[PDB]
Write a protein that binds this ligand. Structure first.
Ligand SMILES: Nc1nc2c(ncn2[C@@H]2O[C@H](COP(=O)(O)OP(=O)(O)O)[C@@H](O)[C@H]2O)c(=O)[nH]1
Ligand SMILES: [Cl-]
Ligand SMILES: [Zn+2]
Length: 293
């Protein structure tokens, strides 16, 4: 009456001047038009949830922007529920140190990762066992991990179920299959540059999910975004110990609980070594903690 017909939408397209809004009520995308003065020093990004009014079959007047829970810087997208870090045991060769760096970075940006090992169709019997070994390490560390083959399609349905209702972004090094997976999910190709004015686009797919058509990080050094002294707050399996020993850096402290956990097999030598490498600390003691595997 004096009140507007407010409806909820999601910004799925954001280029220079334009805003594309996916209206949840009908699944249609409308041209979004901000309405108001605070509302233009109010930055609106892909991923932002908005409330507004449908003005006509092709236009939606944006009245409010919901507070966002996170904001990634590549691509520039708000409210990401899962960063899908695509990895492969081989082709390319898995690099656990770089995956650990990437996990630290996404934990810092406050986005939950899901590790997806692709190309399982290429593995021999011994490689399958090695892959299971890495999967156990990451699951024990506290992360969700899935296996898929974008080539055969195996595991893709399980991934779609896992991603229900989520806004997602694909990340991982070149060649792991990010574009192949996006193709399985949406029939679309991952956008790059030219074999600079791209924009961000979220593509609806599966059970009410959305995935970006541009990727997240490929290979990243955690300290480009996280202070070295803060890296320890982003190793998931360290957190229970840090709750009782808030100041322990897990470096030269002789009775460090994390080192004890590594010695007893509760924390993997692989993850602990990545931690020390990231903060650039060499410990002679590592030879005594890591010698069984
Ligand atoms: N054998 C096999 N090859 C795959 C699979 N997924 C992708 N590929 C191939 O891996 C290569 C790189 O895939 P692409 O999607 O471009 O990787 P991206 O650089 O991470 O986007 C291409 O030749 C894909 O056809 C898979 O599950 N099994
Ligand atoms: Cl500790
Ligand atoms: Zn410690």
């Amino acid at each position: 009456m004096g009140k507007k017909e407010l409806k909820r939408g999601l910004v799925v397209d954001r280029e220079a001047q334009m805003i594309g809004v996916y209206l949840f009520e009908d699944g249609k995308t409308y041209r979004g038009i901000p309405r108001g003065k605070v509302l233009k020093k109010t930055k609106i990004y892909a991923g932002d949830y908005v409330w507004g009014e449908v003005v006509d079959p092709n236009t939606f007047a944006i009245e409010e922007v919901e507070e966002r829970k996170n904001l990634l810087i590549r691509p520039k997208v708000a409210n990401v529920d899962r960063v899908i870090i695509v990895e492969t045991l081989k082709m390319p060769e898995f690099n656990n140190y770089l995956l650990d760096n990437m996990l630290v970075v996404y934990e810092y940006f406050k986005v939950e990762p899901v590790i997806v090992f692709n190309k399982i169709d290429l593995l021999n019997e011994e490689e399958k066992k090695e892959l299971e070994r890495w999967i156990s390490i990451y699951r024990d560390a506290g992360y969700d991990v899935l296996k898929v083959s974008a080539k055969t399609g195996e595991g893709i349905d399980e991934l779609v179920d896992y991603l229900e209702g989520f806004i997602c972004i694909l990340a991982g090094p070149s060649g792991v299959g990010k574009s192949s997976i996006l193709s399985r999910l949406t029939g679309e190709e991952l956008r790059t540059q030219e074999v600079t004015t791209t924009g961000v686009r979220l593509i609806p797919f599966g059970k009410g999910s959305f995935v970006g058509d541009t990727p997240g990080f490929s290979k990243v050094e955690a300290t480009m975004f996280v202070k070295p002294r803060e890296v320890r707050n982003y190793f998931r399996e360290f957190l229970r110990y840090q709750c009782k020993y808030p100041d322990c850096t897990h470096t030269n402290e002789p009775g460090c609980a994390v080192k004890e956990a590594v010695k007893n097999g509760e924390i993997s030598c692989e993850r602990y070594k990545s931690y020390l490498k990231i903060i650039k600390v060499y410990l002679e003691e590592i030879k005594e903690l890591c010698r069984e595997d």
